[PDB]
Amino acid sequence: SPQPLEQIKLSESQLSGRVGMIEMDLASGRTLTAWRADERFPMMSTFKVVLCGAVLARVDAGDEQLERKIHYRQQDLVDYSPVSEKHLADGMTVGELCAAAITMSDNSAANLLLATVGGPAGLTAFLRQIGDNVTRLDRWETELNEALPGDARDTTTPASMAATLRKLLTSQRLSARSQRQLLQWMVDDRVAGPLIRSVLPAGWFIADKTGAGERGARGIVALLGPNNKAERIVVIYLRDTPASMAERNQQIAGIGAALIEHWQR
Numbered sequence: 656s657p658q659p660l661e662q663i664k665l666s667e668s669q670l671s672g673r674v675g676m677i678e679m680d681l682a683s684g685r686t687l688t689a690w691r692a693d694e695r696f697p698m699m700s701t702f703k704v705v706l707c708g709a710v711l712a713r714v715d716a717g718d719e720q721l722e723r724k725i726h727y728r729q730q731d732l733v734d735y736s737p738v739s740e741k742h743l744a745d746g747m748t749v750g751e752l753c754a755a756a757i758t759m760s761d762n763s764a765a766n767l768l769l770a771t772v773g774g775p776a777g778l779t780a781f782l783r784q785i786g787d788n789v790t791r792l793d794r795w796e797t798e799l800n801e802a803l804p805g806d807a808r809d810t811t812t813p814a815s816m817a818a819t820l821r822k823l824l825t826s827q828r829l830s831a832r833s834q835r836q837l838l839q840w841m842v843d844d845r846v847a848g849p850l851i852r853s854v855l856p857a858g859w860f861i862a863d864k865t866g867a868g869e870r871g872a873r874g875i876v877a878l879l880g881p882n883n884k885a886e887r888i889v890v891i892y893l894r895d896t897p898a899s900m901a902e903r904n905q906q907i908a909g910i911g912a913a914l915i916e917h918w919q920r
């Protein structure tokens with residue numbers, strides 16, 4: 656494979672789409688590879704990790720419990736809710752809702768959790784509290800995926816999302832147990848995790864959350880590294896491409912291949 660930046664450029668040309676990428680050391684925060692890292696991209700379902708960071712912050716403060724069971728209704732549901740649809744009779748705990756939101760991208764679980772943190776405005780305020788002055792959530796699932804050209808709603812930048820993920824996972828803003836819970840949810844992703852493992856060389860750690868929207872919008876936030884370690888945060892977003900889902904997946908995978916083959920920096 657080409658050098659990472661050369662592959663990123665190639666992916667843009669082939670997608671006739673815009674790619675945003677950062678690769679960041681998890682321990683120190685050093686930025687290593689960056690491409691359009693200050694440009695805005697729809698977060699799509701990648702926001703669900705930040706959401707559950709805010710939920711965990713409430714748990715740490717004693718204003719929420721992961722055990723607390725929410726008995727929601729059918730009128731609360733939006734599309735792509737495979738876990739929450741199974742529990743109208745019996746409900747789900749707040750912890751189960753975060754697991755469903757992160758590991759199965761469950762949209763109704765995400766909306767239920769979003770209300771508990773003050774809606775899109777509440778989650779945006781949490782972002783400002785942790786020093787992210789860029790990322791913004793404006794809408795609920797599933798409208799937040801609309802990815803209209805030029806629309807700043809529901810966007811982040813690769814650089815902001817990577818810094819925010821590092822803050823949530825490692826900065827001790829969250830308790831030790833909460834940091835470990837957030838990481839474990841990403842480790843347990845079922846949407847893309849197992850597929851990604853199936854194509855990674857032996858020894859490469861993966862934890863992730865993916866996202867998909869309109870107009871070609873597609874993304875992933877991940878922890879990746881050799882020697883079975885979460886060495887780096889890698890954030891890749893695509894937007895404004897007419898390409899097939901299959902190609903968008905392959906192009907992200909190709910950028911990943913370039914990183915794997917050319918990891919020392």
Ligand SMILES: OC[C@H]1O[C@H](O[C@H]2[C@H](O)[C@@H](O)[C@H](OCCCCCCC3CCCCC3)O[C@@H]2CO)[C@H](O)[C@@H](O)[C@@H]1O
Binds near residue numbers: 913
């Ligand atoms: O020499 C390096 C490696 O070259 C190949 O590995 C290939 C692998 O066979 C292929 O499946 C993967 O595709 C890329 C899969 C990436 C998965 C998505 C990545 C995510 C992860 C977080 C960042 C965003 C994207 O590329 C690597 C590197 O060429 C060999 O198979 C392997 O034995 C060898 O160790």
Ligand SMILES: *[B]([O])([O])[C][N]C(=O)[C]([C][C]C1=[C][C]=C([O])[C]=[C]1)[N]C(=O)N1[C][C]N([C][C])C(=O)C1=O
Binds near residue numbers: 762797866869
């Ligand atoms: B996350 O990325 O925010 C969850 N994403 C969504 O719910 C996406 C669908 C993603 C998807 C792509 C391809 C598939 O085969 C299956 C699922 N939802 C949307 O993009 N939208 C956009 C806007 N409208 C809201 C009126 C939708 O109906 C919708 O679901």
